[PDB]
Amino acid sequence: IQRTPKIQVYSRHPAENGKSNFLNCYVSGFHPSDIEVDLLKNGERIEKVEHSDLSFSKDWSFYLLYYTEFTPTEKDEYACRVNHVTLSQPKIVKWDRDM
Amino acid sequence: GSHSMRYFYTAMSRPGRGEPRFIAVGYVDDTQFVRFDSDAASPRTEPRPPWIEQEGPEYWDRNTQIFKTNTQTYRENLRIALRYYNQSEAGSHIIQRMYGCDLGPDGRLLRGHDQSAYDGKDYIALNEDLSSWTAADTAAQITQRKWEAARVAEQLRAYLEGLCVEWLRRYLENGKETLQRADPPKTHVTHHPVSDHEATLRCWALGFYPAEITLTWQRDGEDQTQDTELVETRPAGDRTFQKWAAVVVPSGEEQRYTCHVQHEGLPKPLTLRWEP
Amino acid sequence: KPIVQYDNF
């Protein structure tokens, strides 16, 4: 089977401009396991991103957490770019501090 | 039940790119504690939470040989599965397994588990009696007759009722400061106008452990299940989780809506309203 | 501790 990833971009703690935090990109509900995830800062790939070990839910779909340390500001824009075999083109989800 | 131990195995073939990859992860409730990946330069089983590190050198060696043996076994299984489904050696396939035990409030086996899947579909599962199997198709039926003949359910039953329960109890003692500590959710409500006639109310729940939580929106005490948008519970990255439920309401009627939060880290249920 | 049981499909 093939299941499309569900994507959520949010921060570890509530956003406060100028203060350190962690940008999270959680991808879940997908199958098969290969997936490409990138964290973006103003359209460019962030270099130091870490991710959790591959695991799966009771319905067999996989999930992964990709995260990086960051300092929000009002000018800078962040997003998560995901590519999977079920996607005709990479899906990008921008970070909104209210979700 | 109150607590559980689960191991998740994933084996993936990748023709033209080496031998099939084998990953194993272990959890106690919502906390990962071990990891193994045959693709790691010098594959060893690694600790993922502080309380497992106190285990001696022989625990790590024994774990590593089990996962190394599993790598071999699952590589054989992927080859066998191709024949059962008349598939070519040119495609990429996945076998997943999930097994473990649930401990009830009294500290004894509540129920055992052991399920396998092929390409994301159920393949074979151990029944709750820990004696029989449910095969999903005619291919799994072959594995089933093989497992009945080798008396596999009996081996699993011994494990699930014994070792699985002893070790889960041991990990709970060793990691009690975190494993047996519920972190209640820090809750708050936000308001976001969408137009002159409607506003979005968002009920947030942050910092909780374990993951299990219930967030409900109520209009004059009636559950707005049909109009509530909920996000899937998500990890924060520091062991805790987050979740929010939102509802679009008519401007000025915000006070007729309440958010209800239920979590075992809370003495009694929380009721939130939007305070302007 | 994982289970010491290895059976083929």
Are residues B173 and B195 located together in one domain of the fold?
Answer: no
Q: How far apart are CA B95 and CA B222, in angstroms?
A: 44
Contacts of B26 (CB under 8 A, 6+ apart): B5, B6, B7, B8, B32, B33, B34, B35, C2
> Smallest CA–CA separation between A44 and chain B, in Å?
23
> Smallest CA–CA separation between C1 and chain B, in Å?
6
Q: Which residues of C touch B63 (CB under 8 A)?
A: 1-2
Report whether B59 contacts B107 (CB < 8 A): no
Are residues B167 and B258 located together in one domain of the fold?
Answer: no
Amino acid at B59: Y
Q: Which candidate, B53, B25, B28, places its Cα nearest to that of B37?
A: B25
Rg (CA), chain A: 14
* CATH code where residue B97 lies: 3.30.500.10
Are residues B17 and B84 located together in one domain of the fold?
Answer: yes
Q: Which candidate, A67, C2, C9, places its Cα nearest to that of B73?
A: C9
Number of domains in chain B: 2
Are residues B135 and B223 located together in one domain of the fold?
Answer: no
Q: What tokens does B222 get?
A: 């009636």
Are residues B131 and B175 located together in one domain of the fold?
Answer: yes
Are residues B170 and B193 located together in one domain of the fold?
Answer: no
Report whether B229 contacts B217 (CB < 8 A): no
Report whether B273 contacts B261 (CB < 8 A): no
Q: Which candidate, B72, B67, B83, places its Cα nearest to that of B143?
A: B83
* CATH code where residue B213 lies: 2.60.40.10
Range of the domain at B248: 182-272
Q: Which of B163, B181, B199 is the last residue of a domain?
A: B181
Q: Which candidate, B41, B47, B45, places its Cα nearest to that of B9?
A: B45
Are residues B117 and B158 located together in one domain of the fold?
Answer: yes
Q: Which residues of A touch B27 (CB under 8 A)?
A: 55
> Smallest CA–CA separation between B238 and chain C, in Å?
24
Are residues B151 and B221 located together in one domain of the fold?
Answer: no
CB atoms within 10 A of CB B9: 22
Are residues B159 and B80 located together in one domain of the fold?
Answer: yes
Are residues B225 and B96 located together in one domain of the fold?
Answer: no
Q: How far apart are CA A52 and CA A8, in angstroms?
A: 15
| Domains, in order of start, for chain A | 1-99 (2.60.40.10)
Q: How far apart are CA B146 and CA B192, in angstroms?
A: 60
Q: Which candidate, A8, A27, A6, A12, places its Cα nearest to that of A68?
A: A12
- The structure's method of determination equals X-ray
Q: Which of B181, B212, B242 is the last residue of a domain?
A: B181
Q: Which residues of C touch B142 (CB under 8 A)?
A: 9
CB pair distance less than 8 Å for A14 and B206: yes
CB atoms within 10 A of CB B261: 22
3-class SS of residue B104 = coil
Q: What are phi and psi of B126, to 5 degrees?
A: -80, 130
Q: Which of B181, B196, B213 is the last residue of a domain?
A: B181
Is any Cβ of chain A less than 8 angstroms from the Cβ of B191? no
* Interface contacts (B, C; CB < 8 Å): 44
Report whether B264 contacts B211 (CB < 8 A): no
Q: Which candidate, B211, B202, B185, places its Cα nearest to that of B31?
A: B211
